[PDB]
Structures are given as C-alpha cells and as structure tokens.
Amino acid sequence: AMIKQRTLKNIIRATGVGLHSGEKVYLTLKPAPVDTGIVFSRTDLDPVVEIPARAENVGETTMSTTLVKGDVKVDTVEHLLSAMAGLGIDNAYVELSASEVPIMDGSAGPFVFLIQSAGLQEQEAAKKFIRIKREVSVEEGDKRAVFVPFDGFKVSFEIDFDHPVFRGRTQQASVDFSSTSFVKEVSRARTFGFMRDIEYLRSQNLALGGSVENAIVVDENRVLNEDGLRYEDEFVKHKILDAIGDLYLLGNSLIGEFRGFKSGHALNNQLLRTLIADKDAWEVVTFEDARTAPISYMRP
Ligand SMILES: C[C@@H](O)[C@H](NC(=O)c1ccc(C#CC#Cc2ccccc2)cc1)C(=O)NO
Ligand SMILES: [Zn+2]
Incomplete structure (x- = not known):
C-alpha cells in the first residue's frame, strides 16, 4: 500500500x-x-x-x-x-x-x-513529499512566516486586528491535520474584508465581484452578513486556508509545520522562495508503505 x-x-x-x-x-x-x-x-x-x-x-x-x-x-x-x-x-x-x-x-x-x-x-x-529538515523563517516589519520540522502537517496562524469583533482566543488557531479534517474544520472558512478597505479597492477597480454572498464584510463594529459566521474563528481559519493554498505552490505536499504571524500572500511566497533556495532545509521523500507515513489521505 x-x-x-x-x-x-x-x-x-x-x-x-x-x-x-x-x-x-x-x-x-x-x-x-x-x-x-x-x-x-x-x-x-x-x-x-x-x-x-x-x-x-x-x-x-x-x-x-x-x-x-x-x-x-x-x-x-x-x-x-x-x-x-x-x-x-x-x-x-x-x-x-x-x-x-x-x-x-x-x-x-x-x-x-x-x-x-x-x-x-x-x-x-x-x-x-517535501520534508522540512531545518527551520526557515522570513520577516518583514512585524509580519512573520516560519517552517518548522514536524512529523506530520500542521498550520498555526495568528491575526492582529485592533477591532471589536477580533478579540479573545479566536485571533489564533492551530490545525494538526493528523487529528483534524481540512474539509470539516478549514475548507468552509470564507474570505473577508473591512468595509473601508473594500471601498478603497472598489475605487481602484478591484473587489468588483465582491458581495455578502462570497465574502464576510466587517464595518467598524460588526459583521454585516445577515446569516453570520460558519465558525467562531472563521477569519483566522480563512488565513490558515490561504496559507495551505500558497504553500501548495511548492509543487508537493509538505511534511512539516507552518507558523504565520500577520502573514499574507507576499510573505508566504517569500518563505517558499527562501525554503527552495536553502536546499539543506528540505528533502524529497516517498512512502512505499503507508503505515510508516505521518500524513494520511481520504479514500480516492
Ligand atoms: C487575506 C484575505 O483577506 C484576502 N481577501 C481579500 O483581499 C478581499 C478583498 C475584497 C473582498 C470584498 C468584498 C465585498 C463587497 C461588497 C459587499 C457589499 C456591498 C458592496 C461590496 C473580500 C476579500 C483573501 O482571502 N485572499 O486570499
Ligand atoms: Zn483567501
């Protein structure tokens, strides 16, 4: 197998x-x-x-x-x-x-x-699989994206918004995919934006397809979406979703851990480019026996 x-x-x-x-x-x-x-x-x-x-x-x-x-x-x-x-x-x-x-x-x-x-x-x-052998980090101001050796696949993320709907333990989340399901706990997390930023992007002919049916819209004090959230921590789960997608630009599944602090698409790509360049920090591995592998997939 x-x-x-x-x-x-x-x-x-x-x-x-x-x-x-x-x-x-x-x-x-x-x-x-x-x-x-x-x-x-x-x-x-x-x-x-x-x-x-x-x-x-x-x-x-x-x-x-x-x-x-x-x-x-x-x-x-x-x-x-x-x-x-x-x-x-x-x-x-x-x-x-x-x-x-x-x-x-x-x-x-x-x-x-x-x-x-x-x-x-x-x-x-x-x-x-691309296995992380050594730690690789990139920084830019107060933003940080890190790869850590880990026998499995784990994504940690923390957001920092000084805003009334972004408080408590919902600003940080860790998903270990050996025990947690991507489909059930991460896949349904929707993209989001703040109304002032959305108004700026629409003025620059961006966010043109955006609406309450495809995005969580937050004003100065609340979520404008009538039906509410799908997860109590839907915003940080969407950032985890974004990181998984950006990390897949490596071309192969990762055996390791990602930690992001206010990271975005730019810093995520910079982390990939540094990893790829630092060839002592990773190796390619295959599993002829699925029992010895740390990651598991659903039946085809
Ligand atoms: C990193 C993450 O945020 C980022 N999302 C955005 O940048 C983003 C930008 C715009 C909108 C929007 C919108 C809208 C609208 C609207 C609603 C009602 C009336 C008029 C316009 C949503 C997300 C993302 O998911 N990238 O992967
Ligand atoms: Zn996104």
Missing part, C-alpha cells in the same frame, strides 16, 4: 465570477498525467497559455496570489490550490475562460465538493 499520486477521475465544470475583476469565468478541472503538478490554462487565449502552479511563476501578491507567464496572468489561485492540497491532488489541469479563478462562496467548500463529486484517481507513481 504505497502512497500514490492522485488526479481527478472525471472532468468537472463550474461557473462563477472573479472576486477582483468581477468577470464571469468558466472553470474546468481535468485529469493530468503523473508528475504534471497543478497546471493553470488560459483557454480563452490563442494559443492556449499553460502556467504551472509553482513558486517560480508567482507574480503580484498584493490582494491575492497571481500566477504569471510572460504578460498572461491567472489571478486568485489560493482557494482552489488550498482545496487541491487538502484532498491530496498531485496532478490536474485547471482550465479558465478568463484571467481570474471564480470566488464561488469565498471559501474552498465548493471546490472540495466539486473535486470529490468527480472522484479521485490514484496513479501508478509514488507521491512525493
């Missing part, structure tokens, strides 16, 4: 709007051969431009994670990449009719459900 690479069993399609562009977009997830990785494809262009979901192709990291190849872009890939990492998808072609991945409901729930509705296929090649 070796831990095998996985792809999709069937093609699956979805429609949505880009959070920032507001453009209607058709998404197609397709099976892919062994060692392809996650590859984004702009099918609206002629010729079709393919962009591997790797750290080396990350462009602008202000609002969302963008993949670039030349002057062709694919915006906001993190929630989809978070779903693929959470379900152990090694190989897949992601086709898009526009430059931005659809926001859906702001979380990874709809992608996780679409991927599992199509089903997974174990392939005939061993799953490759």
Whole structure:
C-alpha cells in the first residue's frame, strides 16, 4: 500500500465570477498525467497559455496570489490550490475562460465538493513529499512566516486586528491535520474584508465581484452578513486556508509545520522562495508503505 499520486477521475465544470475583476469565468478541472503538478490554462487565449502552479511563476501578491507567464496572468489561485492540497491532488489541469479563478462562496467548500463529486484517481507513481529538515523563517516589519520540522502537517496562524469583533482566543488557531479534517474544520472558512478597505479597492477597480454572498464584510463594529459566521474563528481559519493554498505552490505536499504571524500572500511566497533556495532545509521523500507515513489521505 504505497502512497500514490492522485488526479481527478472525471472532468468537472463550474461557473462563477472573479472576486477582483468581477468577470464571469468558466472553470474546468481535468485529469493530468503523473508528475504534471497543478497546471493553470488560459483557454480563452490563442494559443492556449499553460502556467504551472509553482513558486517560480508567482507574480503580484498584493490582494491575492497571481500566477504569471510572460504578460498572461491567472489571478486568485489560493482557494482552489488550498482545496487541491487538502484532498491530496498531485496532478490536474485547471482550465479558465478568463484571467481570474471564480470566488464561488469565498471559501474552498465548493471546490472540495466539486473535486470529490468527480472522484479521485490514484496513479501508478509514488507521491512525493517535501520534508522540512531545518527551520526557515522570513520577516518583514512585524509580519512573520516560519517552517518548522514536524512529523506530520500542521498550520498555526495568528491575526492582529485592533477591532471589536477580533478579540479573545479566536485571533489564533492551530490545525494538526493528523487529528483534524481540512474539509470539516478549514475548507468552509470564507474570505473577508473591512468595509473601508473594500471601498478603497472598489475605487481602484478591484473587489468588483465582491458581495455578502462570497465574502464576510466587517464595518467598524460588526459583521454585516445577515446569516453570520460558519465558525467562531472563521477569519483566522480563512488565513490558515490561504496559507495551505500558497504553500501548495511548492509543487508537493509538505511534511512539516507552518507558523504565520500577520502573514499574507507576499510573505508566504517569500518563505517558499527562501525554503527552495536553502536546499539543506528540505528533502524529497516517498512512502512505499503507508503505515510508516505521518500524513494520511481520504479514500480516492
Ligand atoms: C487575506 C484575505 O483577506 C484576502 N481577501 C481579500 O483581499 C478581499 C478583498 C475584497 C473582498 C470584498 C468584498 C465585498 C463587497 C461588497 C459587499 C457589499 C456591498 C458592496 C461590496 C473580500 C476579500 C483573501 O482571502 N485572499 O486570499
Ligand atoms: Zn483567501
């Protein structure tokens, strides 16, 4: 029982709007051969431009994670990449009719459900993991992102907002994926923004697809969303979701621990680039016997 690479069993399609562009977009997830990785494809262009979901192709990291190849872009890939990492998808072609991945409901729930509705296929090649051997850290002002050696996969995150809805123990969370489910405890965490920031982004022709149906909107004192939150600590869980997605730009699942302190898409990519460059801090490992592996996946 070796831990095998996985792809999709069937093609699956979805429609949505880009959070920032507001453009209607058709998404197609397709099976892919062994060692392809996650590859984004702009099918609206002629010729079709393919962009591997790797750290080396990350462009602008202000609002969302963008993949670039030349002057062709694919915006906001993190929630989809978070779903693929959470379900152990090694190989897949992601086709898009526009430059931005659809926001859906702001979380990874709809992608996780679409991927599992199509089903997974174990392939005939061993799953490759990146094991953290030494600590790697990056800092920028009071922000920090760290990789720590750990026999499993764990993500810790802390946010720091001086605001009435962001107090208590809900500003920090730790998820150990050996005991906790990505689907149940992290996948449904929606993206969020403060109204003054959203107003600024809309004035710069950004956040155009944003709404209460795909984002948690917080004003100076409350959550404006009528139906409320899905988790008591939904905001820090969304940051954990973002980190899993950004970390998947390594190209393989991690055996280690991530700790983020006010970290974002920019600092997360800087942590990846430093890890990749410090080759003594990591190694590639496979598991011919799943009983000796510290990470476990759900049946395909
Ligand atoms: C890091 C994380 O925050 C970040 N999210 C955002 O940057 C973000 C930006 C804009 C909006 C929005 C919106 C809206 C709206 C609206 C609602 C009612 C009336 C008018 C507009 C939501 C999230 C994120 O999830 N990146 O992965
Ligand atoms: Zn996000």
